[model samples]
Target: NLKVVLVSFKQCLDEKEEVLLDPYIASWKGLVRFLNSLGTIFSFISKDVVSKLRIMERLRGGPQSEHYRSLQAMVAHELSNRLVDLERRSHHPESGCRTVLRLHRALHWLQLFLEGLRTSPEDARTSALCADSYNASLAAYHPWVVRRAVTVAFCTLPTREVFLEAMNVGPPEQAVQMLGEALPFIQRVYNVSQKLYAEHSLLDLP
Candidate 1:
């Protein structure tokens, strides 16, 4: 397992099958740590993710926070109150619904990239791998200008050897082994959030 990475994601769900705010945020924190460990070039991406996380953190602690405990709860509360901007962020810019939606989209990109890492053969360039994941998931929502910059950032990603080592899960073999065991939880979490967003028609929220 990814140990610390696994614990947060594994505990991200409640007995009622709702995603827990604390653990979901914690899971992203761990991924951010891994991404930041790569280099400053990756900081640009992490900055946006961190900002979204901060927005969610605030809502979780704000008044009526009880309604912000899970994706389902926040969706119901925000939708019922008309807090989310279904077209743009002009109003309720800090809405937890949209903020978490951004994070939820990023989660798909991260999941795809990690899955690539887990299965890719040695000697593969992370740049290409990340580009594939980005293109498939987050690239379309991003502006063309930002998408160009993101591709450039992927260019500086560490090599497979270095990347695996950065996982801090011992050698490459062990890291790959642990990733195999730990990544399913990420997929499950992503699927849960994806379904909730789809059902609420919140997938296109600005």
Candidate 2:
């Protein structure tokens, strides 16, 4: 039933959706907590991600914030004026759709990266898994220099044994065992956001 709510939130945005993304955000935060436990190398990435998440978090608050409440309310309020540039932006710089685009972008990286991890062989190396995942999904948008630095940082990902335990799923074997079920939930959340953004043509904002 809750999964239906997640999809429906986007259906409205597409065809009815925060009312949706909060759980997805909460999920990513837990993943970040897992990632953070890996070591200092992940801190730079985690810190930036935390900042972006906070930007979304702030909307679910205060008296003047009602317009920012649900995905439905946000699109109706922001896009009603055509304040969104669609192709680029000058005015309405902090428009709700625009902020969502940032988080939407980050979530894909985690999804693909985790998918890679979930399916990899028991002997898989962390650096290779991280690099392949990043290059395929997130690397294209980043600059050459940023890409180089990010690749360097991924080199330090902790071993899979240490990494799986950090999932707090009990034993290392249990973490891997659970990932089979875990990933599809993440996929549903991503598809919801994907359709909502694409339907409104808000994915291309600059």
Candidate 3:
């Protein structure tokens, strides 16, 4: 039964279903705890790079000010004026070529992905919606690193049963509660990114 649910999740993720991925990403801590509860069967999938990237240290620190309104503008301002290293530099700086724009662009995908989860109906196909949103909004802007990381995360997602179990959403009541708790986390991440971009004046990169 667990194996079957896992397969379903993989299929749903590959298919880009909004009904699943949105909730999955939004309440990921619950999902991770659930996976851990299952013991060693799915331990390998525990690593969460997306969450790690959200840490304050990685989001701040660079040329320009601190925050900005949007990634597109940030990239445009910083890269256009040579404030940051959009292109290669002489000494290979610690930050390298990964600009705030790259981070902001990825955040846009995260926002879209979470928003899809927040609003998607139960019967909605979440996998397709997630993929569509990614393709439409974030795919072009993603460099190879971000693209590869996202693909790997999707590939390793747990089965649907594990997903539901981790989410603790056995009933509508629990689901609603979980959603309420999860939404704020998503918003905080979004807000942090928005502020960071706005402060730096890098919201509109081309």
Candidate 4:
């Protein structure tokens, strides 16, 4: 079940090269559920992440939601109409481009984080890997406060062994093996998305 969801991002990209928020949100909800299983300390991160996800959820439910179906579709719709900020002050805080840009960034973080955990030793500290992964990706855009909060939240992560057990993907070693298999696909999706966004200037969405 987790692996199915783990592989969904790549599948979405390969099929029609994008997705709707319903399918889009599923991947994040999956990861957040994993985080939630770790403990309450992930609550704030999960809460914040859920809030952002919910924002897109509402957007997808709003008027003429059809156009917001895929990241590519949403960008074409907004970009053609000049609704996105591109790289300056954001006038439309809830615009589709802005909403999805954050999703892309967070999803990229997930790929890197999972890749780190996949190779980490049995005795490795999950919290340290999580913190390191976030720093290497997500922390760049976050402010001092948000970054600090997330860092504190990751400090509550269980041990690497405990986390593997939580995955319910078999033994810790098996889960690591599965992750190694899954991450390259995630990496492909991220790379595809990054190139598309950069080409359209959506990479700097505000």
The alpha-carbon lDDT assigned to residue 119 of candidate 2 equals 75
Residue-level lDDT tens digits of model 2 in 1-206: 22232223232222243345455456557656755766787688788778766766776554536676566566777788675767657876666678777767766776677667677777777788878988887787788997888888877766776667655676766666666565565566567767777887777777
Writing each residue's lDDT as its tens digit, candidate 3 over 17-55 gives: 112222223344444555466555345435433343343
Ranking by lDDT: 1, 4, 2, 3
Better-scoring candidate (TM-score), 1 or 3: 1
Q: Which wins on TM-score, candidate 1 or candidate 4? A: 1
Best by lDDT: 1
Q: Quote each prediction's TM-score.
A: 0.93, 0.79, 0.45, 0.88
- Misplaced by over 4 Å in model 4 are 87-90
- Top candidate by TM-score: 1
Candidate 1 residue lDDT tens string, 1-206: 24577556888887788988988988888878876776798888788888888888888888978998888888899989988888877879889887888888887887888889888988888888899999998998999999999999988876887878866889888888887777788788889988998988888887
- Those runs of model 3 whose alpha carbons end farther than 4 Å from true positions after fitting are 1-83, 86-104, 143-165, 203-206
**Cα deviation in Å at residue 63, candidate 4?**
2.6
Q: List where candidate 1 sits over 4 angstroms from the true fold.
A: 1-3
The lDDT per prediction is 0.84, 0.66, 0.45, 0.77
Worst 10 residues of 4 by lDDT: 11-20
